[PDB]
Amino acid sequence: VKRTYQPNKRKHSKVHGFRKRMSTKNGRKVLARRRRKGRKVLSA
Amino acid sequence: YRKLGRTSDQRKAMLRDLATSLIISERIETTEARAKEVRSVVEKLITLGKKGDLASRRNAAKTLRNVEILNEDETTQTALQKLFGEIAERYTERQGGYTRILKQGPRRGDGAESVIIELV
Amino acid sequence: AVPKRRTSKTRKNKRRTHFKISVPGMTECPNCEYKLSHRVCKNC
Amino acid sequence: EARDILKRPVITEKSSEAMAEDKYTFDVDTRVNKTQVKMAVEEIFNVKVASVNIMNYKPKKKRMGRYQGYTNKRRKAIVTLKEGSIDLF
């Protein structure tokens, strides 16, 4: 049966990518939180 | 008679293959139950070959496979030709009992009893 | 459907009383070491 | 910059088979185009270049114990000579 995750490079980059995060204040808050926690990966 | 863990069509086909392989190679290694079943098939075939007539040859053709055998030097013959040629002549004066089974013991993969069945 | 109580060491070994294998039926090879009775050497 | 464009010759069985057909294989800088590679080859080896074929190789997953990683990404140029010859050895 069809499952929830149907991968799509373009969709993934456009919704969760770096530039989409930079595009809003709350996305920049996400990036700041992840930098503060010390994550290796900040976004897609 | 044994079922050999196969359907009737599969069992019939396997017995034909084993009988033809025995006729060709004259000595094969198989499991105990398969050999005990195929001794009857092969010996009835040899009986037909000793009979020798055209009807016997066609009845034998009902059971034998269509395999070719390269003989001493690049000369071919069929398993049916060998059965009605050399094999039948070898057993002209023998009344039954053209095969024997020699037990070898269990084999590694499944513990099955390996045996050799050969033409006498 | 499920064990009501665990099986003690004593009961388990009692049950395993008959869980064993037997010595093979074997005979010395008069000419060709030892072999299974009613079997050919197949290696000698 | 011609000696920065060309990093090293590629010596493999396939590259030797290409050498038999006057085709020379180099690892090149990953930021250069095939026109730059042709000019660099002409400047360094004083030969005439008929054509350049170029390709990119993705980083290769690699490990050393618990340390898994990647090799460097590569750019491979195959240079077909019009005239001249190149004595790498």
Added chain:
RNA sequence: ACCGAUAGUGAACAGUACCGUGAGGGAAAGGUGAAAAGCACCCCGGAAGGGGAGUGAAAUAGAACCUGAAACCGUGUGCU
């Protein structure tokens, strides 16, 4: 008159591995020996692994390496 590896940071070797579309969640894992002197050589074995011979104060300190409790798993047998 703080902790001493289940403690003390989540983290003594990690915001990693792993999980999630994502925001996010988030581990386990310290100790050979004073010194590598880390077992030449022989034997069984394809190897693994062993028995010797050596090193060492010690090898039941041989790297799954200080100590090595209990559960649990075996071998022998004094009484039954």
Added chain:
RNA sequence: CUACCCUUGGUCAGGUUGAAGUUCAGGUAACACUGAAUGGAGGACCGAACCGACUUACGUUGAAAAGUGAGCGGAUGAACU
């Protein structure tokens, strides 16, 4: 994923039926009207692909956190993708 929607693409073996119109032959003062032919309409019919999920059997520490087998509904449309 799922619901609705927007833009832009794709897909639907075969068989059946035979609307309106048109032509002819009548019929008429004219027009109705009749018959044949043709014509090819329809959220039309039967039925594969495809889309469903009515019954039943199996499965129920599953092959599977919703499936499989056998039939079953739709199948040019408010279709499916």
Added chain:
RNA sequence: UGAGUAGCGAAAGACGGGUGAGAAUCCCGUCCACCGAUUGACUAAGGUUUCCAGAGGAAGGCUCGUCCGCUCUGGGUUAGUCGGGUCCUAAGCUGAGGCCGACAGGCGUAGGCGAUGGAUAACAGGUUGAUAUUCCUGUACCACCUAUAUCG
């Protein structure tokens, strides 16, 4: 503990020969059998080296294993014309100035981005262990540049 118990995930295999310490399970052969509007062939997405060769058999593989999509070492993807960019726009997204809003921001004009559509020049054959309309051979085409004689 339950227990050497349940299970080992839709099915047709047999034999010969080989290799090996070890073979129902690897290789080769013959016969048999299954799919065939597909269990065949080719594109897309997605994955990202799983591809090829040589070597291996601790772990992984529901058994075995000499084998492997597993391990080690070394390799492999070639384009003016294929698909995309140096072309075009749709939905939608964004948006100089601008309008509105406690802040943060929301909306929107010109403009821009954006294919699932429009435009757009290369074909046949051969060849490798692994690439091929990309490499080679043969024969072409398109755009630009220069040299030897209306554009809008």
Added chain:
RNA sequence: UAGAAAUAGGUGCCCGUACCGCAAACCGACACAGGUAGUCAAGAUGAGAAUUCUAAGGUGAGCGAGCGAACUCUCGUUAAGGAACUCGGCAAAAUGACCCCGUAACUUCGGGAGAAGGGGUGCUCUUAGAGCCGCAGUGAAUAGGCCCAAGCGACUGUUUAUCAAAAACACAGGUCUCUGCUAAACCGUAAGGUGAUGUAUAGGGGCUGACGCCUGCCCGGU
């Protein structure tokens, strides 16, 4: 419109290109009986991409060997009877393709209808007959069971992904009501939008629900 050649030789960049790809490599925690868009479309049979067997090409399914107990599951047959079973004919059996006859009540005149119910079918020869063989000739596979009557809903469609597909929702049709346009209604604090690049034969909201015949009395209360 304003406005201001051939020939020869040469040059032509970046990104992707391996491999799997209706799967052992993708989505399903698995080398998971599931899900995954398009394209190519052989022969015999047939209306056909149905059916059965094959071609191209691929594959033998990553546990086996025996035995042939009960019981469970899938499958086949069954004397006499034929729904006596059971909540209920659940399941199974029966029907089934093609060609030719024939076909009721009722009806919105389309239908109902494949109504129902019958007949035929192999092979050989001669030009529709004459023969031949079997228990059986669409000799396999695949291919509607039908009729009478009542309730509900007109109808095709839609629904509780994962115990309910229905009489529930929708529907074409009816009616009431709002709305004169910066419409009403709706989203939004606003700007800006939908309504609509529409304008009362239009747009929103309530109720009813094809069609036929109809839809009575009460305005005291809200």
